[PDB]
């Protein structure tokens, strides 16, 4: 597949890996989203960074709210901005 | 890199490939986003699908509006919902 098609396939795969764990496969809880981020990304060395810590805390504070696919992807974009080296500057 | 890290790296790479073409590398026009989608995804056989056609038309109707990274990723999520086979049903 083309690079972007590959990217989307992976986004969908990881979403379903966690959304399929409990209830409706169309959503996952913010608690489950926090777990997903910590396990699926090599983010361990960056969790204390001021901006990433606030994103992670927001998830904890709203742990029982559900997240659909659209919101999950939007979230990944937000994280990428403060997590991806290429997006610095 | 882990699968999700790979996914994000590709999302950022494709964004910059088009955002770097004119002006500020932090945005790209909706006209440029339409081009990106048509070239970076094997979407040719699906462009007449009722829902994808409306997304594509919306881009045309708003061709000169700028799109930042966050909005670009959010858009990809919206497209994926009506474009990705795994997200059907």
Swiss-Prot record, chains A, B:
Post-translational modification: The N-terminus is blocked.
InterPro entries: EF-hand-dom_pair (IPR011992), EF_Hand_1_Ca_BS (IPR018247), EF_hand_dom (IPR002048), S-100A6 (IPR034118), S100/CaBP7/8-like_CS (IPR001751), S100_Ca-bd_sub (IPR013787)
Subcellular location, record wording: Nucleus envelope; Cytoplasm; Cell membrane
Keywords for the protein's UniProt record, in alphabetical order: Acetylation, Calcium, Cell membrane, Cytoplasm, Membrane, Metal-binding, Nucleus, Phosphoprotein, Repeat
GO MF, one example: protein homodimerization activity
Domain named EF-hand: residues: 11-46, 47-82
Modified residues (N6-succinyllysine): 46
GO biological process: axonogenesis; positive regulation of fibroblast proliferation; signal transduction
Origin superkingdom: Eukaryota
Binding, Ca(2+) 1: 27, 32
N6-acetyllysine PTM sites in chain numbering: 39, 46
Residues reported to bind Ca(2+) 2: 60, 62, 64, 66, 71
Cellular compartments per GO CC: collagen-containing extracellular matrix; cytoplasm; cytoplasmic side of plasma membrane; cytosol; extracellular exosome; extracellular region; nuclear envelope; nucleus
Residue list for modification Phosphoserine: 45
Topology in membrane: Peripheral membrane protein
First-listed, main subcellular location of the protein, grouped into a coarse class: nucleus
Induction (UniProt): Preferentially expressed when quiescent fibroblasts are stimulated to proliferate. It is inducible by growth factors and overexpressed in acute myeloid leukemias.
Role this protein plays: May function as calcium sensor and modulator, contributing to cellular calcium signaling. May function by interacting with other proteins, such as TPR-containing proteins, and indirectly play a role in many physiological processes such as the reorganization of the actin cytoskeleton and in cell motility. Binds 2 calcium ions. Calcium binding is cooperative.
Note: This protein co-purified with the prolactin receptor.
Subunit structure: Homodimer; head to tail assembly of 2 subunits. Interacts with CACYBP in a calcium-dependent manner. Interacts with ANXA2 and ANXA11 (via N-terminus). Interacts with SUGT1. Interacts with TP53; has higher affinity for TP53 that is phosphorylated on its N-terminal domain, and lower affinity for TP53 that is phosphorylated on its C-terminal domain. Interacts with tropomyosin. Interacts with FKBP4. Interacts with PPP5C (via TPR repeats); the interaction is calcium-dependent and modulates PPP5C activity. Interacts with TPPP; this interaction inhibits TPPP dimerization.
Protein's UniProt name: Protein S100-A6
Organism name: Homo sapiens
């Amino acid at each position: 597949a083309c690079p972007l098609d590959q990217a989307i396939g992976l986004l969908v795969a990881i979403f379903h890996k966690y959304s399929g764990r409990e209830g409706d496969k169309h959503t996952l809880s913010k608690k489950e989203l926090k777990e997903l981020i910590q396990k699926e990304l090599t983010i361990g060395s960056k969790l204390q960074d001021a901006e990433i810590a606030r994103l992670m805390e927001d998830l904890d504070r709203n742990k029982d709210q559900e997240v659909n696919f659209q919101e999950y992807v939007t979230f990944l974009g937000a994280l990428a901005l403060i997590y991806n080296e290429a997006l610095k500057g």
